[PDB]
């Protein structure tokens, strides 16, 4: 059995990553059909980064100012348009490795695998999720722009993330493939801090069910609690308010293990007021909120007795 | 910034995964050139994992019994050989997606990425480590046999693991691509179990070294201690004794850092009693030992792989 933080096979995405260069700046781009997507701050320099006028920079730019590299073969740019905060570079040849894809703007709390890239080549793949403050706790260095996040459903690659910047607190912020940012962020050089990062309550509960399958059944309580008793009382270290939509998707995990959704919420009420003197849970020490209820069933193909 | 447990881009490996079927059992196989590698226990139906004669079943079974299937086209096997504990099938045509591969055997302590596959189709990829007891705490389900572990240098894929079975204790055991098991395990399912597991000391120091490279500073101090006395507490606790070569491997981690290898020993001997009076230690308030120093520099630099 076992349970680990897995990521989707990044193979289908590697075939779409290319290198985009504009002047002295070099970052990654997503090659889909005959269009190359990348963050729009590639056409900017250091002097004009205080308050860039992308409309002015885009028009005054040229097609040959962009140097798109697909591995070692250079791609010819025939047109350039801007959609919000992502740049669309139209090329002459379509990407033969284009997989069936879609653009999905995920909500804060959902997970997705990221493919970190540098100079158009993939470096690594990891799983993560958007924090409540519309940020991600990924790992990026200089030249990581263009690193996309994605999920794979059946066989279609649902892109959702497009890395742009890194907050001074260490976290990262990005957009979707349509160019809309995630959170109160804008791509310009100004005093821009992150926000209050709480905790994904629903993910924590799901992570508990994942542990119950692989042994670890010593954190079950027999005193369910209501809604306000889990919010106005169980919010000492900031936890996202659980809604009646979370218990809907937690059904399969509840009918599988046998622990009611409301009953599992009482388990956290005991751990959030005490903790452990050294007793580990599944694998980690602090509650992991990086596993959605869909990730658990995805990796714990258990049967739900009825 | 940021430090995640990344896995290698599995693209070059996904193109080598096929579905091997013999009789009624179907497990995964690695298609490299015109040879398909898969566990030897594919020729053994679910009624022979006790003491079956393999060289007798191999010469008895012909080529029509096997059924190798790629993405959508079925292959044709010609020669079937058994090397140690891997069933080699010499197919008709060679895999056009064959990368510059390489069969290497890793000793307990090194890390590698695992590509989980079912029915010849990848499903997930994660990063793990070879435990001191010659096992891995991976995530596998029924039908995952044949899934391989690999490392990438740049253009070369270093295969090092092939899943064969799961032990009753939850961990998983397998072989290299030469067919030799990791540890005193056998393919015939008996009452075999893994030994006592220990924590990799060199990997914890390499991980604690990245914490400083990132910016986390609160558990640091300076109480020098040479290579003599630290082994006392390392063996009394549940840790692998820090050998002499482990110090030389941490060399490059001290060049672009300046901290002495013997300096971090004072910070580790104190975080094993008082608990976590601070909690935040690069995320996850516990000792992580699945970061080999060779992979800590690659994530703190930007080493890409094609």
Author numbering:
A (entry chain A), B (entry chain C): 1 to 306
Provide the authors' own sentences about this structure as they appear in the paper.
It proteolytically processes the viral polyproteins pp1a and pp1ab at no less than 11 cleavage sites, and thereby also ensures its own release. In this work, we demonstrate that the SARS-CoV-2 Mpro is subject to redox regulation in vitro and contains multiple redox switches including a disulfide-dithiol switch between the catalytic residue C145 and C117, as well as a SONOS switch of residues C22, C44 and K61.
Under reducing conditions, the protein is structurally stable.
